[PDB]
């Protein structure tokens, strides 16, 4: 399955909490956002190629509230969405630095926002108000609302169809919905012992979750089955980040370490200690290169290596 044993640091932007770090549609730019109320955009090649003393964002956009999550648009290169601690979901144009849409219906902090890959005007958010809201960038009002029993910690679109979302809940389950019939979920995935903090898809049928029970889990959303549980990291309290690609899962931990799992193996392939908790991670698509950030504001570019 794998030939890697370590994570190599190839770049570091020295430091507070980065809630989200995300690549744009082409993996050319990345953005960070968190408690400092600023969305910063960096050029990836510049970060990898230039000395640390010359590092500088190419865009900075100040925000009204602390940020919980970012999601770049998959078709409009220059658009990025944020969710904030007032519950507002904003779409920004990084060229003009202006907000394009401000969606203000959530009544408590929104923990996540996700732009759909296949219907790129659609975006979904979830909140402590116990609502999932689906938005379209062509309309000012939400288009779908799902009332749930417990706080929503994460929502993610299936990568092959805008009709399915995974909803990670404070009730310890993943609720997998077909947005064409929200009367009931397609399936509710149980097994985690604590809240589900992230949900991310490896492929159309493979869904991963992270939970504050110190596990990641892999699920099959075609046949509605558990597949695998991953252990080795410490995550009992915070949003510490989850990122997956076709073969690998990476997550943060409360020991200031990034962990990497291959999807077929239950124990970590490797880890990297910063030096506090890791707070955000993002693979560069299917490559072995990853962005990472921690609660002190340090950003590192890591690469899996033999």
């Amino acid at each position: 399955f794998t030939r890697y044993s370590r994570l190599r640091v190839i770049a570091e932007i020295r430091h507070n909490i980065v809630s989200s770090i995300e690549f744009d549609r082409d993996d050319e730019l990345f953005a960070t956002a968190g408690v400092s109320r600023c969305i910063k955009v960096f050029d990836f090649s510049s970060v990898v190629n230039e000395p640390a003393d010359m590092q500088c964002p190419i865009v900075e956009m100040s925000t009204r509230s602390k940020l919980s999550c970012l999601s770049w648009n998959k078709h409009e290169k220059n658009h990025i969405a944020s969710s904030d601690y007032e519950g507002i979901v904003t779409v920004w144009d990084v060229t003009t630095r202006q907000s394009l849409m401000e969606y203000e219906e959530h009544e408590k902090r929104a923990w996540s926002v996700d732009f759909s890959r296949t219907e790129p005007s659609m975006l979904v958010s979830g909140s402590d108000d116990c609502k999932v809201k689906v938005w379209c960038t062509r309309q000012e009002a939400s288009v779908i609302n799902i009332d749930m029993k417990a706080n929503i910690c994460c929502v993610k679109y299936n990568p092959g169809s805008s009709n399915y979302i995974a909803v990670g809940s404070a009730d310890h389950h993943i609720h997998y919905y077909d947005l064409r019939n929200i009367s009931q979920p397609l399936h509710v995935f149980s097994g985690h012992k604590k809240a589900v903090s992230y949900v991310k898809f490896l492929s159309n049928n493979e869904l991963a979750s992270a939970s504050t029970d110190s596990t990641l889990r892999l699920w099959d959303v075609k046949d509605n089955l558990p597949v695998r549980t991953f252990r080795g990291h410490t995550n009992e309290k915070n949003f510490v980040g989850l990122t997956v690609n076709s073969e690998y899962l990476a997550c943060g931990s409360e020991t200031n370490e990034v962990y990497v799992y291959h999807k077929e193996i239950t124990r970590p392939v490797t880890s990297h200690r910063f030096g506090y908790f890791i707070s955000a991670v993002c693979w560069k698509s299917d490559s072995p290169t990853m962005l990472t950030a921690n609660s002190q504001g340090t950003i590192k570019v890591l690469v899996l290596a033999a």
Partner: peptide, 9 residues
């Protein structure tokens, strides 16, 4: 602090 605490139901 508490700002990134994942809520428990």
């Amino acid at each position: 602090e508490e700002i990134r605490r994942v809520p428990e139901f």
